[PDB]
Each structure stands twice: as structure tokens, then as C-alpha cells.
Design a protein around this nucleic acid. Sequence first.
RNA 1: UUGGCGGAAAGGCCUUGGGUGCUUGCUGGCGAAUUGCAAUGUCAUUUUGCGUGGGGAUAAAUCAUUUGUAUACGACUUAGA
RNA 2: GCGUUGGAUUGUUCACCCACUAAUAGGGAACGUGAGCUGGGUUUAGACCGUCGUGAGACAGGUUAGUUUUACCCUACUGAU
RNA 3: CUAUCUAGCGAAACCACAGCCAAGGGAACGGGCUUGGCAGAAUCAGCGGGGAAAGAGACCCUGUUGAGCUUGACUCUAGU
RNA 4: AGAACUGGUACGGACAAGGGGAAUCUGACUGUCUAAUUAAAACAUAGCAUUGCGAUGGUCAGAAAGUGAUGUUGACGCAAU
RNA 5: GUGAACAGCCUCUAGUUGAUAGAAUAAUGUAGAUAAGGGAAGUCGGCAAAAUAGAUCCGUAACUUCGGGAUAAGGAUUGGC
RNA 6: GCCCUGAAAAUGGAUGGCGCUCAAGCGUGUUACCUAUACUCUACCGUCAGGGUUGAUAUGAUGCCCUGACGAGUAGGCAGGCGUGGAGGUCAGUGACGAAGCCUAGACCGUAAGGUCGGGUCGAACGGCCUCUAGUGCAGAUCUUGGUGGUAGUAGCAAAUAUUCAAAUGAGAACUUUGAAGACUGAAGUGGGGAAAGGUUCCACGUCAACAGCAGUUGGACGUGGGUUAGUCGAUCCUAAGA
RNA 7: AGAACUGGCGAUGCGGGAUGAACCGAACGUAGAGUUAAGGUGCCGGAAUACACGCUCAUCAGACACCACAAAAGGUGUUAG
RNA 8: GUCGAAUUUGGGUAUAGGGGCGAAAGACUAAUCGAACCAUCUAGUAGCUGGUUCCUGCCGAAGUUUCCCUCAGGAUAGCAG
RNA 9: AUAUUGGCGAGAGACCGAUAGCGAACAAGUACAGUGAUGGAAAGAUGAAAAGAACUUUGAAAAGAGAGUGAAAAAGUACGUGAAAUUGUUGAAAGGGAAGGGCAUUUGAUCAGACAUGG
Lengths: 386, 155
Amino acid sequence: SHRKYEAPRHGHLGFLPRKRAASIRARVKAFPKDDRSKPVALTSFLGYKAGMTTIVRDLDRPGSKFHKREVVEAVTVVDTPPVVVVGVVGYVETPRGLRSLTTVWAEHLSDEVKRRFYKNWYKSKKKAFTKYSAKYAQDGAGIERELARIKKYASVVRVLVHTQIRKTPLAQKKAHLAEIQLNGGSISEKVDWAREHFEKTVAVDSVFEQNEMIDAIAVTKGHGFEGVTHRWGTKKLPRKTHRGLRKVACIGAWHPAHVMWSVARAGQRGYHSRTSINHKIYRVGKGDDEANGATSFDRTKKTITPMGGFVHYGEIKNDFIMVKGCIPGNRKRIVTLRKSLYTNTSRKALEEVSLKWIDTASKFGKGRFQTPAEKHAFMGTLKKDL
Amino acid sequence: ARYGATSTNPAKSASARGSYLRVSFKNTRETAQAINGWELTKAQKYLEQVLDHQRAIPFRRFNSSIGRTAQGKEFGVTKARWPAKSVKFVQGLLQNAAANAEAKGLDATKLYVSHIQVNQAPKQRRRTYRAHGRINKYESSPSHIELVVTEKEEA
RNA sequence: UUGGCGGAAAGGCCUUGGGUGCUUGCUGGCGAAUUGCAAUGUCAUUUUGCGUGGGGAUAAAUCAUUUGUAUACGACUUAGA
RNA sequence: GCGUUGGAUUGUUCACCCACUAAUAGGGAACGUGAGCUGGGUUUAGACCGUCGUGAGACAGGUUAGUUUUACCCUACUGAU
RNA sequence: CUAUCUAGCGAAACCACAGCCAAGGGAACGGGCUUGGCAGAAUCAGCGGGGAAAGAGACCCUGUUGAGCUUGACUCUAGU
RNA sequence: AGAACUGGUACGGACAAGGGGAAUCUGACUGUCUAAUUAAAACAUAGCAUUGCGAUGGUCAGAAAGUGAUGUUGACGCAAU
RNA sequence: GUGAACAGCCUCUAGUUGAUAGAAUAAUGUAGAUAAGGGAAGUCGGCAAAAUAGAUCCGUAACUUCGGGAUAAGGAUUGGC
RNA sequence: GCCCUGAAAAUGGAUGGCGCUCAAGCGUGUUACCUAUACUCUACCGUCAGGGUUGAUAUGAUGCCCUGACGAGUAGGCAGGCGUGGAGGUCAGUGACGAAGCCUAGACCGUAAGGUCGGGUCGAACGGCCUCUAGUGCAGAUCUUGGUGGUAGUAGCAAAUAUUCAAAUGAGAACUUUGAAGACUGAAGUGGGGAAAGGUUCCACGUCAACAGCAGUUGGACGUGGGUUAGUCGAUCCUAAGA
RNA sequence: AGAACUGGCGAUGCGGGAUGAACCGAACGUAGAGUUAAGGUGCCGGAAUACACGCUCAUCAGACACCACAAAAGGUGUUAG
RNA sequence: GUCGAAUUUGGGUAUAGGGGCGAAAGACUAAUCGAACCAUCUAGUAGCUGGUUCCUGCCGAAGUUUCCCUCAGGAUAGCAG
RNA sequence: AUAUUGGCGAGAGACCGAUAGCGAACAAGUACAGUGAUGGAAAGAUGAAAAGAACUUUGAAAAGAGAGUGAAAAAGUACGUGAAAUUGUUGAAAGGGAAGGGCAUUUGAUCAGACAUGG
Ligand SMILES: [Mg+2]
């Protein structure tokens, strides 16, 4: 007979079922609208999240109390070493949706990728793409025909790329492989750009740039079987409740004589796919660079890796994307970094950023120094050394 | 003498019983079917690994609320167990069989378990003390086991 | 067998050249019964096993062990010649 | 489509006042919701009053103290093979 | 410490038959009926919506059914 | 009991161990009861008052009795409220 | 031994080491803990919990049956050498 | 007239559903067609009624035969039958060369209650017909007694701080014995004795089928034996409320 | 809630009204063949997407007795008068 | 809560069912108390509730009248065999 | 002459046939319960005869596999027959939220009645 007072329901019904994601590499369910009037380039990038740190920068926001003032912001540093092309895939518009028509692979497929097709790599004969490589022997034909098949039909073209996970601290040898939509001009130019990159390499600076807003697609940190209180933000029952209080009291009215799809129940928290949008890029680091974490303001040779390594991850020896704020996923987890589905003409989105300082103290405790230099300069000499 | 239905050559076949056995009828049942039809040595080698928690016994009938194991995959199943007391008895009977089959000059290597059936012995009854002055039964569900081993046909 | 065309599920379609069986377009020579006055008389294509003779190719997954980006148990993600 | 509140007094539903607020709308779902709680009121047996009765006792009159049991089944729902 | 998973051990409650809904009519709130929605083996941990879940109505009335108690009700009595 | 010195101002170092105050309703107080839902303000109590009785008696017991309680008592007592 | 102490805590003689066990560490529990800022806004109701607590010295209101009230309230001190 | 406004309710839903617009909607008319246990003709079952026929004339006179009509049924009445324990009579009945009983998606008869047969199992009795007789027929009674299921290999076997290494014995050792380590009760004791009570549980040897809600070689278990010594300890004597 | 006459249901299947004690049709031995009732004949579904003259367009049409309702009051919608 | 007394407790002894015992709750009187436990009278009575055991064939109802401490029941007349 | 659900000795039954008949067909007023008075069960059947399974072999044993006894172990001191619930195994079959039933037929399995006409 009508709830006594009114309050909004606990939780978002759009994010159901709260199950564990079908895979640990979160699917990319849309790419940007293809403008065929501009160069061929990747529309998303693979990468491994490494950790977070802090930035200092002047804000450029006219009319704000913090315009022309320093602000400190959290950033996450996702470890993105260059990816490698090994295939193209053509999709044909049907009245039942996009369909993969064919796929052509590269002559040579690396061990990192090859392993992705094996459960038990070590005790296998590694016969992965052996007979398929023979298709390249007949000077063209087999391969050439299918490239032509894509050019003729095929409404959209995707490339198969994969991570060089070896260039990365991770114990995992098996590499992550994914399709990526080619958004540069002409279906023909697409497959050609694709063919001219087989076995070769694409890096993030050819995909993303400073102050670019990018979305982030990842499976959310797992937490196992959750009670109703934390899974749904439900009010706790009073201390005097017999047999428990981390519940909900009324799982339903008498009629319908059924528990309904919409009330809160205990079960899996975490490990959910999430496409989080609109994270402004704050740095496109270079791997060779020894001043990753340096600034035109803070002019010392230091790498983006904090003292002690990124905790539970290790060092950043490759190019990296530094994005504002936080991002779905935990450290070590594969992340797709997709560029935007729309042209945010905002103001927040238009602000060009210059970092003033990048934090690099140990995240493994209350870090007090930025560099080995600084720690020595401050502490003087110790019983060890010299 | 007088086993259950047997459609086997009695002269290529030796057999073994075990009556009023204090093992779980349900559990013994489940492990007996688990080898029902095996080559005797395969059976013996597998019932050993079951004692090792290296393989398992698929629970198919008497089996609800039983936990799940990765070891059931082999038999296209999900709930399975490692019922020692039953593996053990079934082995003693398997071993007696092999014995009698030897005294029959039956070839060891042609032997397979052509028949094996376990059903219920009379209940053995114990009391349990329940709240509020009450008393309930606390019973054993003992077993009869009987198997036969047989010489495989050559074509 | 010569050229093409077909991706909406194209798995089909047009086309070149001869070869071969038939040809009721037309003119001949034979046969049919007794299956007894109807009942029972064209064999269709699925699968699956075996039998041959030719061409062809020469793997993995699971248990166990291992990781902790995962986990109530299964499951998930790693690694091992 | 989306919100519809924080409090003082009362077991209260209702009511009343303070206060904030975009707004503090009205109803249903076995007067939703007790193997979900709580047990303040009503609704056993203790006891104190007033009224009534000769008395035993009585009075939607006041007062105070008064045990809130079971899911392991099926289905539904949450998640998992 | 449990719950959980394993070895051993091993109960009870309850059970017409059973177990997906919506509407209809219906003993005026169906798991079964009618008309529709639909519907795919075998299962694990949880859960408290439903099974008007489980465990000869004490409320109320009826009986030419009681009992405890009271009294210038009927009929008596120990005693005095 | 006093004094000096000493420590990351700590020392009833664990253990052991009263929260306090202003009031209203109510029972004087300690004590008692519904073993297994009521410990209370209910029962008791000291205190106050009343009643009966001088033994051939008061109150009570027994079917009856050469029967019995108070009574190994006597009004500063026994009995009843 | 500590200490006011037959308290709590540790020990000697003596007696036990017996109450199915293994592997994990989800939810929800039962039992034991802690929480920034606010401080009863929670609730029928401060239910539950939290705060006080030994000892020495100082200090101590109304009221009162003069006995109490009273550890009233409120303070300072406490090791070691 | 039809159509529109007036026309607001709580799970998602109902001209029965789909769907239907010169209808598959509303008014009217005309044909054809679909279909009940009803109507018409016929076979058969039964019930009732009317009638013929034992004249010598083989087996049914309560019989054969002819004709007409009729058939719903709770509570309830009557009728004709089916089956059971035992009784008189009779088939000079069946039977160890297999009685009775039981089992049998084998067979035959009856509308049915039921009857008959085959096969298998079994092992000592039993049946048909005419009559007699009743402790004579079950699905129910929260029926009685006994037996068995699903639940279910499930709830559960979590209070009392805590166990570990090795050796011996043994078919078998987390659980027995010895050794070591780690701990506990902490004298208001998990220490040393007694009183009610029990009655051999005491001790030895052997021993594990049941019992000690895991286990067992261990035991307050099982089997076989052994053991309790008084002038001074008690009773006994005394009196107590009382009897 | 209570009477009147009759017919029903109760005690009764069957066809129709989707559904349904009581409405419509029709009451019942076992069957064959024909014909019908009430009700139907786009498809579900057996049977004319039959014939004929009109009416109706509803951003809330309508669609069949009992029966699963609708009113006072309105329209320069369209038809006939 | 109380914890040196209206204290707690052993054994013995007394009181026994319309009786005991009660600092009084209808409490306690061997898990039994607004009348214990045991056996018999006793198969207590029930206008009330529940069950009432084989087949087929025929016929086939009533809930109305009158009287009743009569209204959940009988007698009476009707319907029925 | 009359009474006799006690006692002693007998002769019988259209009685009951082990859930029946006395509570007891048996070491039954027993075992057991209750302070007590009292209450009070369950429980019969190997075979003619133990001839109750020598011996061999696998096992720690219990037993099992052979062998042997017996008319039969389809009688093994769990012992006549050995129903049903419920159960294991084998074999056939079916199974999109119950199963079961009715009329009809397809398919599969099974079972029938036939009987006599010159060589
Ligand atoms: Mg009242």
C-alpha cells in the first residue's frame, strides 16, 4: 500500500546482468564514424595499465576561481608499447548485420601471437599457421585473391593487431590480439594500408595526441560473490535484526508471487566490462626518452617510473599514454583505449594542457624523494657505500 | 551362487561376492558403475588413482548437493567424488575375482569386468539424541557387492 | 573445354568449341501374351557402419602441476620439453 | 521520463508545529512487505486505579510487567558450471 | 569459529498428485481448467516473493456439553 | 614522609576497576513469589488500630471416642481481621 | 610471585594435553575489535555500545528522621633510580 | 442513424486468439454449407407387456418360440449374480508322474463382480455341483500393527586456548604404547579423598563382531580369571523431632 | 433479505454460449447410415475470403441474448428525413 | 540482584487430593495443579465430526405441512420402493 | 432336587489358526518402564536325517571361488513357500515447464484361430 516515503532505487538497471564478463579483453562495441576524407589510421589501441601518479599544472579555464592557478590531478599511466599488424578482416553489410566475409593473415606470425592459439604451448608441435604460410609461395594468387575480395565487397575493414607483451614487465608470454577498424579514406586504400603493414608496427603517437579525449574499455577488477549491501548500496538493517542485517528486508510484495528482476540480490561484484568515456590525454610518452617524467618546468632526467617501480607492475620501458583521472581495470590488465565516437567541442575537452610537474616518489609507502639523487642529497652519506 | 542377470560364458568367467558389507550403498553403487565394463587392469589402475585424488568417481544418481570438480570432465560430468571406503571394498572383490580366475587358468590379459552390481543389505540401526527429549534413528546403509570378470572375445 | 558474371545465405548463372548417347522431323523390319478380369510391379535421399583403388595430411585438449589480473566449489587468467 | 526530504510531541495510521527545498502530490500491490526485522499499541495469565456490582467479577476507560519458532524441498529471483 | 570443497559418519520436518506465467470464468485471490505468452539435458552457492508452506481456532457462536468461582438462585447438608 | 636524578610527559602502563547530576509517579526500608513468557508499584514487614476469650473458655480438628492442635500456654496470652 | 586479597594474570608438586580430521578463506552469520568530522539527528525508549574506575592528598551543595545525603560534585598526584 | 466529446486505477493482456477497414465491423435480405448422446431406418444387449407351444411324440416348462414398446439418475428401495472361512450330501472328483500358494505389457470366457488355461516357481494337500452357515469382500476413518520411500549422501558431526616430530607394535596407526617438543588445569585444580548413588565399572591376560554419532591394534566394551582380611574404622549402644 | 406460479440446478452426462451448477438446444443401453437443433462457416476450426442494398474511419472505432456496465449534456463529421 | 542473615544447604522427621502447603503467584504438592498420580465403575453419553469393504438390472426422491425448551434434532403428513 | 468365568480329573466343538486365539503356541505376567500403586510387549516353521559343508585355493580376518553333503542349497543354523511397497543390475523404449487417461490408427514386438485333398 504505497511506500511510506520516497527514495530513488539502488543501482543502475542498465548495467545488468551483474555477471562475470565473458572474456577478460573487453569488447569494443562501436568505432568512430568513418570519415573517408582523411589518412588511414587505427581507431583504438591495445595496452597494459601500469598504475597511477599525480600531476601539477596550471588550469586554463577563464571564469573559474582556479583559472591561471596550479592544480594537482591524479593520472593513470597505461603502458603502451607499439602493436603489430598481422591481418585484415572485411565486413559486408547484410540484412542480418555486419558479417566477416574473409580474413587474410601475414606470411610470418610471431611466437607471442602464435601462442594465443594454444592452451598447452610448451608440450605442443607449434603447427599454428604453418600450412597457411604456404599460400604465399604461389607468388600471389591465394592471398591476392582475398585482398581483392575485400576491395570488391566489404563495407568496413578491420586490422588484426596484437600486443608485444614481451616488451612489458608481465609474466604472461601469450599476447593479446584484437580487430581494429581502419578509419582512413576508401575501402581500397584501407586494405592496401593494411597489406603494407603486415608484420610491421604501429605506435600510439600515430593514433593519439596531447589533450585528446579518449574512451577506455576494460573488464572491471574482480571481487567475487558480494552481499547485497556493497553490491547495490542498499541501506544496512538495524543492529537488532535477527539473522543478519547486510540484507534487504522486503525482497518483494505478496503479489506478483515472484521475486522480481529488479530487486537487489547477492552475487558477483566486479569483473564487468565497462566502456568509460572522455579521459583527456595528458602525455604521450616516448620509450627511448629518458625524460618521460620531466617537464619544461622541471628539467631533470627522470623516467616516468616511480622509485621502487610501479607497484605490482614494474618499470615503464616503452611509450606510454598518461590519461587524466582514473580508468576501469586494475594493474596488469589489458585495456583497449578507443578514441571518441563524437567531437566533444566542450571547453574542458578543448583545453590544451602543459604539465608542470610529474610525481615519481615511491607508491609503495609515504614516498619522500623523487630521485636517487635527491634522496642522497638530503640524507647525506650512510653506513653503507663509499 | 545365483547372481543377478549375467549374459556371459560361465567358463570364460570367474566371479566374486561380498555381503553385509558396511559401506555406503549409495557411494559403493556409484563407484561400481564407474568401472562397470572396464578391462580389469584399467579398472585396478584407475581405482588406485582415485585413492590418490588423481582421477575421480562420477556421481550420477545418488548425488545432489555434492560439490563440483575439474576431475569430472573426463566423464562429461561435473559432480564427482573420491569415496575411499568403497574403492577399497570394490578392490578387495576385484582382487578376489582375479584370484579365482587364475585358478581357472583364465588368461589375465583377456579379463574385463563383465558384470558388477551392488545393492542394499539390511539396515544396521543406531540411536541419535534429538532436542526436547526426542530420539531418532541413526542408521547404516550396508552393501552387497558382486562382480564377474570375463575373457574377452577375439574376432 | 574457351571466356565471363554473381557475397543478401554469392555455392548458382551466362558463354566458346568440339566429342559422345538418344532423337517421335519422316519411312521400314521385329518383339510384348500365360502377371490369367483390380489388389503388391518407377525407385527418391538421408544418415551410419563396414569392402575395395587412387589421391591426400602426420594434431591437440583435458587431469595432474603452476600463476593471482580470478576464485565458495566448478569456472577464469598465467607458466611448464 | 524523473524527483518528492530533515526534525520536536504521539505506538500510532492520522494529526500538529519547526525547518530546508525545484517540489515537500494522492493512491495500489492479501488495509504490499513478521520462516524480513522490530514488538511501542491493541489482544492471556501479575499488579494499581476510577466507575459499576452484595459478591465472584465487568468496563475499544486510565496504569505498569509480560518467550516473535523451522527452510536443507519445489518454484521465483541472484549469481555459478 | 562456521558456512564452503574433501574422507569417514549420517538424521528429522513435511509429502493427494505435482511444481513457469498473464487474463478469464470459478466456492467472488489457479500449479492443473479456458484463451493466449511460451517452452531444450544434468546441475552448484545463495535467497526469503509464492507453495493462502510447516507446527481437530484459545477469538466468536451453536450444544437442552462441562468445570473453577460468587450470591437471599433452586434443592439440600456437616455443624451449631 | 621528604629530596635529588632520569625518560618520545610516561607510570592503578597487563590485570584488576563507581559514570555523574536536576526531578516527577510509586513502595518506607533489608526481605518474598508466578521452577519453564510477568520480580513489580504485587506479598511480607516493623508500626497503628479493631475483635473474641478467665479454662464448665476462645479459635480450630475428628466418622466416633476415657480423641486432638494452640498448651511445657493464661490477657505483657492465645486466637481472628 | 604480583596485589588489600582464597580476585584476575604467571608458576611448582600432581594431573591432563580428551573432546572427527584435511584443504580453502565467497556471501550471510555467531563471537571479539577499531573508525575521520558530527554527537542521539537513530529509536516506543540511549536498547546495544562507549565513557568512569585502584590509591594518596585536596575539596564537597540542597535537603534531612541529624543517623545520613557522600566515592556527592569537582581537582592534583602515581614509573624508574 | 453510424461516428466523435463527455469516458480517471493500480503485475503485462485480451470482441477467446490472431487479425480485420466497399470488413473478417453496424442494419437488412437470399441461397449453400458444418455439427449433438436429439430425430428417421437397421443389427445386437437388456427390461416390461401381449401371445403361441410338452397331443404320442430324447437334451432346458422357472423351458423353446412370436410380437410391440421402452433404457438419465444422488439419497434411497427391491432384484439377479460374482468371491471368501467352515458344515451335510455328491462327482468311487485333482494330486509327490507335483496339491495349495506365488510370478508372468502369454492365451480364452463373462457387460461386470469374476472364471478358465499355458509357462516359470513351488512342495502336501485341494476342487466342481445341490444345500447349510457366518467373526464373509476396503482406498480412505489425523484408522490399528508392521514394513518401505522421496527428502539425502542432505541438515549436520564448529562451546570448553593446541597441538607437533620420531620410534615401537600391528594386516592396517591423525586416534594405541614409549621417547622428545609445544601447551593447559594453576590448589576456590583438569590435584589427593569421601557422603548419597551405583554394584564390579577395580586388577590381570586375551581380544575388536556389536558399542565409544571419524577411526581403533585403545576402552567404564567383549571373553576368561583374579581381588575387599579389624577387640581399636564404622554399624552395632544412646537418646532427637518423630515412629 | 423475504413471498407468488411455473420451469430448472441440486440428483444430469451430451451439443452450443472460449471459459462457466442454473442460459440456448437437447436429456443418456451397445453400434452403423442419413438428417438436424442451438450455435457457427477469413485462419486457429469442421463449414461460401458466398451473393445483395446501404451505413461506418475512430492520434480511446466496432464486433452478438443471459454477460461480464455506462449517464445528464454536446459536435458546421457524415447519412437519411 | 544480594552476598553475615527474615542467609544458603545435607540427612532425618511431619503434613496427602475438595486434602496438604502457600511472606498469596491460583503458586507449589516427583517435566502433572482453577483439584495430583494409579486401577476399576467404563466399550461412561454425544441431537455433534470422521469412516462404513463385491458386480450388474429396474424403479426413484426431499429440503414442504402440523406439533415439539422446537431453530445442526425428532414426531407427523407428502414425495419413494 | 439348586448355584458354580475358582480348584482337581476328564470327554467334546459347523470356535481361532501366530497382527487370529488368553497378555503369553517360545527361559510371559518374562524383557522393559515407573519412587510407588501399577503398566507390560515382541518372539512359532533348515532337512527324512546335520548328512551343519572334509579338502583345495585368494584373503589380516569376515568371507569369497572351487569341491563336497543332500531328493533339492531355486533348503547353508540370515535357513518351507518367499507376495507388495521400495532397490541393484541387464534389455527395449520415451522424454523443449509433470506424469497418468479416452476414441482412433501408423510403426515395432507378441499371440493366434485354422484342417483337410488326389500322389
Ligand atoms: Mg474488552
